[PDB]
Short mmCIF file of C-alpha atoms in Angstrom, two decimals:
data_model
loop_
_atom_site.label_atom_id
_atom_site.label_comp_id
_atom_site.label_asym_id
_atom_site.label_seq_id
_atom_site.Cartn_x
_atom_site.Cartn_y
_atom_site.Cartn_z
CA UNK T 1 -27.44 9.72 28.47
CA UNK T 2 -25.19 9.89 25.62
CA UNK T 3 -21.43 8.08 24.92
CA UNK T 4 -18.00 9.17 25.53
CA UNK T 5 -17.48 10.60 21.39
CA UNK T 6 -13.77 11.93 20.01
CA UNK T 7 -14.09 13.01 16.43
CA UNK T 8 -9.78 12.84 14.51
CA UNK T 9 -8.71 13.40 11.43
CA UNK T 10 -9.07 10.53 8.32
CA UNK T 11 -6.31 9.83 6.50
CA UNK T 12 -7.49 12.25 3.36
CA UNK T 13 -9.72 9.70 0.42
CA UNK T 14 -9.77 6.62 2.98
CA UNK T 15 -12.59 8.14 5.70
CA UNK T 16 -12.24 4.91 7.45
CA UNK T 17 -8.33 5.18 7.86
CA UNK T 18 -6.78 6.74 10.68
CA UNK T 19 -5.06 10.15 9.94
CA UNK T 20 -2.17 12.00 11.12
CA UNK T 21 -3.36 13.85 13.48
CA UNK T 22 -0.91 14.40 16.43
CA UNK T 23 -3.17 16.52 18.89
CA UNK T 24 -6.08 14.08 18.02
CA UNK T 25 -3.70 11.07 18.39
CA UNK T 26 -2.37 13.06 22.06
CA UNK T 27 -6.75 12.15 23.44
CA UNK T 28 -6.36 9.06 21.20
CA UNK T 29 -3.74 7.45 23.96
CA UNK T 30 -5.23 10.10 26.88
CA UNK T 31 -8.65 8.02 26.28
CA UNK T 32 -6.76 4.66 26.05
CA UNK T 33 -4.61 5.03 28.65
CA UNK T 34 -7.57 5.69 31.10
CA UNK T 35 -9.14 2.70 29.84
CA UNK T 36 -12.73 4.73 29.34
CA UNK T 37 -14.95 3.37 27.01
CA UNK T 38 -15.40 5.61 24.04
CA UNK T 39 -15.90 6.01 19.91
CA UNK T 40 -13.63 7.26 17.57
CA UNK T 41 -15.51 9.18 14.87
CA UNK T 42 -13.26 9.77 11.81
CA UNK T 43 -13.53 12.38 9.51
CA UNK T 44 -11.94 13.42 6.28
CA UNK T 45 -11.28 17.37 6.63
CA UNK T 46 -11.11 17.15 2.61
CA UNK T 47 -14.63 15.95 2.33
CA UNK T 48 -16.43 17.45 5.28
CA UNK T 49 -19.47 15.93 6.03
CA UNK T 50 -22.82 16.98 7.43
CA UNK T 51 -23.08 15.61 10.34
CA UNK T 52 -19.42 16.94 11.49
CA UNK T 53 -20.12 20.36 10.60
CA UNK T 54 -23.39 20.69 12.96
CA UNK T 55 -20.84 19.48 16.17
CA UNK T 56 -18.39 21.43 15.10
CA UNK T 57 -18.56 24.28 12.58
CA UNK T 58 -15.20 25.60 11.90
CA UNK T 59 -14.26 22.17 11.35
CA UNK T 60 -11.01 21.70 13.54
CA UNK T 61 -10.22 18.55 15.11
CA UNK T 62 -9.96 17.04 17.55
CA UNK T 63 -13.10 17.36 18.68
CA UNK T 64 -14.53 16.04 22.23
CA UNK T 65 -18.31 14.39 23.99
CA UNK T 66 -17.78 13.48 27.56
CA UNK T 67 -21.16 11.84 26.94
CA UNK T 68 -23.03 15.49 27.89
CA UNK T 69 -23.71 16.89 24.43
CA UNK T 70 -21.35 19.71 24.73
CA UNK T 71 -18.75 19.41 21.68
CA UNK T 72 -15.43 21.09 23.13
CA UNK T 73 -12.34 21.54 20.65
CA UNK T 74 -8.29 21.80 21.64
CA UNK T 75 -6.05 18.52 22.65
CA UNK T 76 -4.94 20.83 25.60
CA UNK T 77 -8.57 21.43 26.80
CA UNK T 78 -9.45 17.87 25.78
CA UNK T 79 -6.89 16.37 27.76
CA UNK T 80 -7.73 18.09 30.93
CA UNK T 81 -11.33 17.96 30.80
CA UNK T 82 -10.29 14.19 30.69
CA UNK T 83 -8.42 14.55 33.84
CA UNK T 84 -10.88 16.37 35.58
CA UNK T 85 -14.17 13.74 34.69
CA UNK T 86 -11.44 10.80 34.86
CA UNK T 87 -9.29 10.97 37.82
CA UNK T 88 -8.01 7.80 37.76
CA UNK T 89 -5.72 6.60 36.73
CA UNK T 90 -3.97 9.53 37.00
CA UNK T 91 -1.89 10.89 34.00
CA UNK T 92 -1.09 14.22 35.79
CA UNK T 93 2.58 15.52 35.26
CA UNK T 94 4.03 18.05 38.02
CA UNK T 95 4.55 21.82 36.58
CA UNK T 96 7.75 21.52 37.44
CA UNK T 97 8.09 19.22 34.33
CA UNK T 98 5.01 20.62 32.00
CA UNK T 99 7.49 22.82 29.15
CA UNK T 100 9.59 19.75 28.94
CA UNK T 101 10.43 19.90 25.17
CA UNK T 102 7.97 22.45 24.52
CA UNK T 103 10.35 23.65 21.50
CA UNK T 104 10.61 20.62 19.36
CA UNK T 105 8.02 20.62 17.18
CA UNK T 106 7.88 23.97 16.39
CA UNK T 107 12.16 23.20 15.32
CA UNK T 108 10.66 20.20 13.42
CA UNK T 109 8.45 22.11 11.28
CA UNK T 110 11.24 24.78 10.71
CA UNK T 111 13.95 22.74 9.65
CA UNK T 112 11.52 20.06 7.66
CA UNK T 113 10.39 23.24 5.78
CA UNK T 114 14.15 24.63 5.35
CA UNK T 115 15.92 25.11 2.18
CA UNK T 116 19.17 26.31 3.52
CA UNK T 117 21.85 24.52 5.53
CA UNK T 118 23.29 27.38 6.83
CA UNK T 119 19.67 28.10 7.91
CA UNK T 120 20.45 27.28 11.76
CA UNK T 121 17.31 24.82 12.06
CA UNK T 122 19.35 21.71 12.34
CA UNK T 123 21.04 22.88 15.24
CA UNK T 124 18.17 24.47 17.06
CA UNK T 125 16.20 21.07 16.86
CA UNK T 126 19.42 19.01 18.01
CA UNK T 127 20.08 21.56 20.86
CA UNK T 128 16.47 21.41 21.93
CA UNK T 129 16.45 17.15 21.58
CA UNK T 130 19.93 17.49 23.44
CA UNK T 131 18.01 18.90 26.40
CA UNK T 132 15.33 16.84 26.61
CA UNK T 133 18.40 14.24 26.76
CA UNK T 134 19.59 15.75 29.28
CA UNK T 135 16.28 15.46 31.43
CA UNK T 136 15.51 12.35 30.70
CA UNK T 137 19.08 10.90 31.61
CA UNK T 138 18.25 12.76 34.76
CA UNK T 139 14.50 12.08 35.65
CA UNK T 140 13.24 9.71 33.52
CA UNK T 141 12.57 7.27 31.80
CA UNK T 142 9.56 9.21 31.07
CA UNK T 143 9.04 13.09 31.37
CA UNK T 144 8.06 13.02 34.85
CA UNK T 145 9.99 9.33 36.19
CA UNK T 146 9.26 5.97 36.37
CA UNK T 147 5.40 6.29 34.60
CA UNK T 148 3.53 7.25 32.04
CA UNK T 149 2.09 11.25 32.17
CA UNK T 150 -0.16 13.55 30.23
CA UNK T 151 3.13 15.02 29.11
CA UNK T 152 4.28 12.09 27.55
CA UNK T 153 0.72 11.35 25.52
CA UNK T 154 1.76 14.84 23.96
CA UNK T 155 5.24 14.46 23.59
CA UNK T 156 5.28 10.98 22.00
CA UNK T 157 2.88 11.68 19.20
CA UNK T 158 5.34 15.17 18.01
CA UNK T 159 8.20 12.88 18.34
CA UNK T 160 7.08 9.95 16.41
CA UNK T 161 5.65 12.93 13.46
CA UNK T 162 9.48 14.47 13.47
CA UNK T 163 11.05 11.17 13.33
CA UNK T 164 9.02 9.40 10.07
CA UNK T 165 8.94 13.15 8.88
CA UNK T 166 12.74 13.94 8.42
CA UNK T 167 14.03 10.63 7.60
CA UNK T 168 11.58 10.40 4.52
CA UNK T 169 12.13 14.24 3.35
CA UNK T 170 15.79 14.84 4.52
CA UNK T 171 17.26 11.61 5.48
CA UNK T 172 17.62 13.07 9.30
CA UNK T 173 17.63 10.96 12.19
CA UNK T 174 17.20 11.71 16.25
CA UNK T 175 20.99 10.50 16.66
CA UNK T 176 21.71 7.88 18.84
CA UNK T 177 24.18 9.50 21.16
CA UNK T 178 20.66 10.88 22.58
CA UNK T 179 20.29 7.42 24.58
CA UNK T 180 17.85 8.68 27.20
CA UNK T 181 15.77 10.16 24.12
CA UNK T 182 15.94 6.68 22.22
CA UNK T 183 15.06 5.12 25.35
CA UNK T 184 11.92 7.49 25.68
CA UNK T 185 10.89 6.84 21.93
CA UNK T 186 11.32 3.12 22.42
CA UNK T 187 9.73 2.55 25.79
CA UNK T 188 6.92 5.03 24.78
CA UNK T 189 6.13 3.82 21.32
CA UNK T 190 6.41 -0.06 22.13
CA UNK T 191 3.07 1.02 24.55
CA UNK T 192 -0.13 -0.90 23.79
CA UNK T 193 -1.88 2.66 23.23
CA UNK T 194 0.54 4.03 20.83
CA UNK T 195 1.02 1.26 18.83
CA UNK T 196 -2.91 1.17 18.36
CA UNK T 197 -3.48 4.98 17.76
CA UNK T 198 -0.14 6.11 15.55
CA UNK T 199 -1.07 6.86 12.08
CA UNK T 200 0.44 4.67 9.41
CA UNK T 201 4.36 6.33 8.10
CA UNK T 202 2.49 6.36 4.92
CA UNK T 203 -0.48 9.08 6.21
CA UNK T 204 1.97 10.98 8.28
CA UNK T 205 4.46 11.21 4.77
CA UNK T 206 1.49 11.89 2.49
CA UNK T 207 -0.26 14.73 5.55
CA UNK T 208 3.19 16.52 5.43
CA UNK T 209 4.13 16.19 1.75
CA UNK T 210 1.92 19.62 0.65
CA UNK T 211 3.90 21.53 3.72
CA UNK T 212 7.31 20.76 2.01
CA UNK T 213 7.26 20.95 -1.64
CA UNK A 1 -10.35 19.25 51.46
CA UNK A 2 -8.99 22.51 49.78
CA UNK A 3 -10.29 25.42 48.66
CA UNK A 4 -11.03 26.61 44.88
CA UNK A 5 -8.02 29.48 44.55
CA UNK A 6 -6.70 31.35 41.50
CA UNK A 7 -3.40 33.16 40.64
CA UNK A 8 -3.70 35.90 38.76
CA UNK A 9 -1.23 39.33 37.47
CA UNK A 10 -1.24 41.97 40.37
CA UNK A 11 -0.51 45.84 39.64
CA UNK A 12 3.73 45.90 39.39
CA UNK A 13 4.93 46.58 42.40
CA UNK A 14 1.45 46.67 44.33
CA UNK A 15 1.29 43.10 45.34
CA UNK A 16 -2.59 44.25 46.79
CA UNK A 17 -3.92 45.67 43.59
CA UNK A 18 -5.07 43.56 40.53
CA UNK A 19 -3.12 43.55 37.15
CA UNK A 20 -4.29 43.85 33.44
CA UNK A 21 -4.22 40.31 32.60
CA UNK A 22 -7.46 39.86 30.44
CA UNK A 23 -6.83 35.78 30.21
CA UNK A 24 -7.08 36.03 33.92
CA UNK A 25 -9.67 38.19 34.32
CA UNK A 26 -11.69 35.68 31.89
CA UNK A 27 -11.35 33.16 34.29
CA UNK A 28 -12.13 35.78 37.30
CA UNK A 29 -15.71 36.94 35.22
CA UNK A 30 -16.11 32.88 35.03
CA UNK A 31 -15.72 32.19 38.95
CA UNK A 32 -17.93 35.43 39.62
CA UNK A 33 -20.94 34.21 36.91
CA UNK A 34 -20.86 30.86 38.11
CA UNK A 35 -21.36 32.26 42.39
CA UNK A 36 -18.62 29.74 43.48
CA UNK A 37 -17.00 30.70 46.73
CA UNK A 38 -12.93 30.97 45.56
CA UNK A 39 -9.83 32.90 46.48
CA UNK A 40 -8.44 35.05 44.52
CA UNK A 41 -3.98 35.25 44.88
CA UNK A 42 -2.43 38.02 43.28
CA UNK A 43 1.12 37.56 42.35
CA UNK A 44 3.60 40.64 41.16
CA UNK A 45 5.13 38.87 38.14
CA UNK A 46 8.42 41.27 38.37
CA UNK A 47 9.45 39.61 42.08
CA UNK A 48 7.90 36.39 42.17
CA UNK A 49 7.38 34.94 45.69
CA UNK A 50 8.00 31.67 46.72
CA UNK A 51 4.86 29.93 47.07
CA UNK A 52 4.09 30.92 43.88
CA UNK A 53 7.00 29.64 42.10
CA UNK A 54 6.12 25.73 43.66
CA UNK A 55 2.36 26.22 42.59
CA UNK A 56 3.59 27.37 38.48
CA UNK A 57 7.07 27.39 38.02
CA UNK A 58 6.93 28.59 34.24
CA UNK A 59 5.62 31.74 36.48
CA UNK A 60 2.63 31.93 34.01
CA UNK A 61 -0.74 33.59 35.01
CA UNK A 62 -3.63 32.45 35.45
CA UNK A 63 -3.12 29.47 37.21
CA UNK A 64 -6.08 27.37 39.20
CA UNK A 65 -7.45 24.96 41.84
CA UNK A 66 -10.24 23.68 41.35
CA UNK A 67 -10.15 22.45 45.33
CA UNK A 68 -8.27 19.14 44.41
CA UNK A 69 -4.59 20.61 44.67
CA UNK A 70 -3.88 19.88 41.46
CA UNK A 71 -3.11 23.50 39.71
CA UNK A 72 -3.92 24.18 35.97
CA UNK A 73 -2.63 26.81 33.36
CA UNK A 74 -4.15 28.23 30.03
CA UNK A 75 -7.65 30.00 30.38
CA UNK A 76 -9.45 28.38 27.69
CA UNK A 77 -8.38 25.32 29.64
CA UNK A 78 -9.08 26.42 33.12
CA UNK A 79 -12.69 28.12 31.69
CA UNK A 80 -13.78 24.42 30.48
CA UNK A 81 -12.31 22.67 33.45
CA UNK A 82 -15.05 24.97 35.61
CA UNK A 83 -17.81 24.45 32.71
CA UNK A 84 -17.24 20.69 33.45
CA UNK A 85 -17.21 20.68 37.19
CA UNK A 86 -19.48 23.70 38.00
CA UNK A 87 -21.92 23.11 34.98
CA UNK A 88 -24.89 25.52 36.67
CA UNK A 89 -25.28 28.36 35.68
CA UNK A 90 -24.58 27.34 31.73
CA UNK A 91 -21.97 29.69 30.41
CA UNK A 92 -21.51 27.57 27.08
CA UNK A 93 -21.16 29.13 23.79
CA UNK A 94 -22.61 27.28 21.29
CA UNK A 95 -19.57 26.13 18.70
CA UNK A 96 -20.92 27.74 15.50
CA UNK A 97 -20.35 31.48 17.53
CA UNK A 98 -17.09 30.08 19.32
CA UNK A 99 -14.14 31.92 17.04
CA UNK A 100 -16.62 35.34 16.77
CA UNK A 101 -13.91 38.45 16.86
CA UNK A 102 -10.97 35.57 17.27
CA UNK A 103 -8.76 37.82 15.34
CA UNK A 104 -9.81 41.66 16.75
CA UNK A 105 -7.12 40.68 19.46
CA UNK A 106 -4.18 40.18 17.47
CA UNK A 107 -5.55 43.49 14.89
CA UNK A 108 -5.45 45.38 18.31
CA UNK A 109 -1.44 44.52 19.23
CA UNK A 110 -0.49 45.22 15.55
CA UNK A 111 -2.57 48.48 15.32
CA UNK A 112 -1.42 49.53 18.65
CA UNK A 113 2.44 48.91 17.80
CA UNK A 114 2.19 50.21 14.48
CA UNK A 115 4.64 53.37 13.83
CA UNK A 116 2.95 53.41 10.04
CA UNK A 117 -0.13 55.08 9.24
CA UNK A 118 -0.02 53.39 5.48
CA UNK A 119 0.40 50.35 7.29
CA UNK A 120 -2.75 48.75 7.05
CA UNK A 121 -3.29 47.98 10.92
CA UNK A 122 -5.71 50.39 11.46
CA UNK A 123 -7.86 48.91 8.51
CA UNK A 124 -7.60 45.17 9.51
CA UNK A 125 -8.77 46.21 12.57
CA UNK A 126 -11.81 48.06 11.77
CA UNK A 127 -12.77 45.74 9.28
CA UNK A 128 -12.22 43.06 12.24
CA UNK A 129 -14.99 44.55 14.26
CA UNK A 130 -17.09 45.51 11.27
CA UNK A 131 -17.75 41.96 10.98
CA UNK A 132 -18.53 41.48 14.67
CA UNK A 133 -20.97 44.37 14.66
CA UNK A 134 -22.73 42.31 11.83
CA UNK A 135 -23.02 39.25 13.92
CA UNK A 136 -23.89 41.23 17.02
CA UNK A 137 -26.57 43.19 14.95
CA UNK A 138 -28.13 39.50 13.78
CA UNK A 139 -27.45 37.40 16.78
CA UNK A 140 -27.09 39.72 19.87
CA UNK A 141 -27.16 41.51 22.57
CA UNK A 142 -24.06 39.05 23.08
CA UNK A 143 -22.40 36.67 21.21
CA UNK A 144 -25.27 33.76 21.84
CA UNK A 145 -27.81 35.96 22.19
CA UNK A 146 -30.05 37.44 25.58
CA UNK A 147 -27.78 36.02 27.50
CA UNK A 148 -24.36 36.06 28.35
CA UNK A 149 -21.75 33.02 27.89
CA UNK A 150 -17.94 31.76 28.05
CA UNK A 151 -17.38 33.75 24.27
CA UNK A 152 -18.42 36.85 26.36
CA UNK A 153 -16.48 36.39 29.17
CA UNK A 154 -13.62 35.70 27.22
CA UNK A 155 -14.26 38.95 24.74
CA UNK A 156 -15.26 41.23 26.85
CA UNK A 157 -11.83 41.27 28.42
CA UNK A 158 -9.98 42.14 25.69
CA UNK A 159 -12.47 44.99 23.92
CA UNK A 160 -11.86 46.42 27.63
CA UNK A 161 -7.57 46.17 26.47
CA UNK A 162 -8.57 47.79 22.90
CA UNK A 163 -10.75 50.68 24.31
CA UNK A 164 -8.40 51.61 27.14
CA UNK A 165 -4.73 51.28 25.34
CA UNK A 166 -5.87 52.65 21.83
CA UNK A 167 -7.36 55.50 23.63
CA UNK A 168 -4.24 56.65 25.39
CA UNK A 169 -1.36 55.63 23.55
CA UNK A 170 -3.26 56.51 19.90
CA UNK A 171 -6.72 58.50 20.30
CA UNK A 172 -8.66 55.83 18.77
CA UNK A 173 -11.72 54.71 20.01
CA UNK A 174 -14.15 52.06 18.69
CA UNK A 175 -16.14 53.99 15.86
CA UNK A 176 -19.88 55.21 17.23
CA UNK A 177 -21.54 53.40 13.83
CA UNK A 178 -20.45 50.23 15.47
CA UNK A 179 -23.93 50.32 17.16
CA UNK A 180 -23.73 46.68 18.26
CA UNK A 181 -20.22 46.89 19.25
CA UNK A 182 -20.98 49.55 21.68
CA UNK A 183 -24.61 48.20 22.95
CA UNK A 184 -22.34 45.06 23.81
CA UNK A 185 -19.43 46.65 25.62
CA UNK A 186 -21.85 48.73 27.05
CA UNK A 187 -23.83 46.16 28.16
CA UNK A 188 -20.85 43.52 29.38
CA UNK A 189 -18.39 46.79 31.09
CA UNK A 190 -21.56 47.61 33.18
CA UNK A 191 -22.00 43.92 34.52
CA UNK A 192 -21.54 43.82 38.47
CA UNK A 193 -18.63 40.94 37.32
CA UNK A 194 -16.90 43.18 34.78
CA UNK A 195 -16.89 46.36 37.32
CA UNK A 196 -15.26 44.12 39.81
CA UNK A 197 -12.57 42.06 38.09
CA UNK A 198 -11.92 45.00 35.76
CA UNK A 199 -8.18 46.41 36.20
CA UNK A 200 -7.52 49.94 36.73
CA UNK A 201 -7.04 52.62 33.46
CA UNK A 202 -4.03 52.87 35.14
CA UNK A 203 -2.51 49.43 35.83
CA UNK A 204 -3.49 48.70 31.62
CA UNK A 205 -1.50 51.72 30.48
CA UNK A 206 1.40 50.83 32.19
CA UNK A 207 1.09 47.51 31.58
CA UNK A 208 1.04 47.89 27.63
CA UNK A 209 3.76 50.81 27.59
CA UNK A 210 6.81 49.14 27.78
CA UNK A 211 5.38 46.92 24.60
CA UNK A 212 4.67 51.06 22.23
CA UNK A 213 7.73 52.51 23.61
#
């Protein structure tokens, strides 16, 4: 029977360059992490080709093979159907921890896209990276303690997109009073997997570029 | 080792009688079509017990165990998980029908909110499931065909919201020329699994009238 298949964005023009992807790069270290042998089928979304538009139509990636044939799409659905087929080792995070800075991105996006300084955005983001500090300082150093969780393959990748993202386009930093955060970003993005599957600053810049004009 | 369970929304204040959640009752029409032996928990989201709160304590619905103790959220998530581990009977879609009537949903909330008549809603909507008459009509009974899979299970749900809510709170019912539309709903509402995991007229209605006011 067939291979363990992940298809993830190209960086756009270079099909064999690794995009920016962050919820393809979130099964990237899932896949990595669980040490399961596997291919990484790249595609450029701005030159679809035929063979990714027969596994999967609306072309959306990331798209999954657990070696069965059946094409399944969503990092969230990905990740788990991961768990499920690959129990160990385990990358399960407790409930109790699963919204941990749930609000980020969606505060990155806003105040990357923002015009206005009196917009707000800033201080949303900080007050939502503040708490994050705050359980990390608490119950780290990773989302849920001492290892490495599913949490933290999704976290990291959102993080590491906000980070290259605002210091090229508004000269904004995660500040550094956020030591538990810094910490988190340093211990997480040092990792074998990461370092392997992050998309170069130059693909994430160049992916985000359009969105801010 | 443990049983296969799910939470899902009981009737407020009727801890014994099932809810209108139609992401939960996707996941009950999966658990029925599939003949696995499960459990099905009902929790009153407006007082929360205990036991409850240490299984999901986001106090999000549906949660499930697939027998390992390890409980999941998100139904698309949860469906795939039981594709995965319970893979007979097939209930998968193929991908190039997977986002057929994504948006009739969404058309629904908006239509039903709406306070405008000249706002367009009521349009969107039709149009909506205009187009998934024309697929139905091509490609039917269901969504892939003779038989019914995870797109159905997943659909049929939330035509049941639209047909119950829009007749009430507006008068509107799914137009009669929508042959396909109504051979389908007709077809899926009449399924021993649909009959059973179905919520109440009732329970619905109140459900969605704090959201019309």
């Amino acid at each position: 029977h067939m291979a363990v298949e992940v298809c993830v964005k190209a960086a756009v023009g270079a099909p064999d360059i690794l995009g920016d992807c962050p919820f393809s790069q979130r099964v990237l270290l899932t896949l990595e992490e669980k040490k399961i042998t596997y291919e990484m089928k790249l595609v450029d979304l701005s030159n679809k080709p035929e063979w990714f538009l027969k596994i999967s139509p609306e072309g959306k990636v990331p798209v999954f093979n657990s070696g069965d044939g059946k094409w399944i799409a969503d990092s969230d659905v990905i990740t788990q159907v991961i768990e499920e087929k690959f129990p160990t080792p385990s990358l399960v995070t407790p409930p109790e921890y699963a919204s941990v800075g749930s609000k980020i991105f969606p505060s990155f996006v806003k105040f990357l896209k923002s015009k206005d300084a009196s917009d707000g955005s800033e201080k949303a983001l900080l007050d939502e990276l503040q708490a994050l500090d705050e359980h990390l300082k608490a119950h780290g150093p990773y989302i849920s303690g001492e290892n490495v969780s599913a949490a933290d393959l999704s976290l990291g990748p959102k993080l590491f997109h906000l980070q290259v993202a605002l210091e090229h386009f508004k000269g904004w930093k995660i500040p550094e009073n956020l030591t538990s955060v810094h910490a988190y970003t340093k211990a997480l993005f040092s990792r074998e997997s990461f370092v392997k599957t992050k998309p170069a600053n130059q693909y994430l810049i160049a992916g985000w570029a359009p969105k801010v004009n």
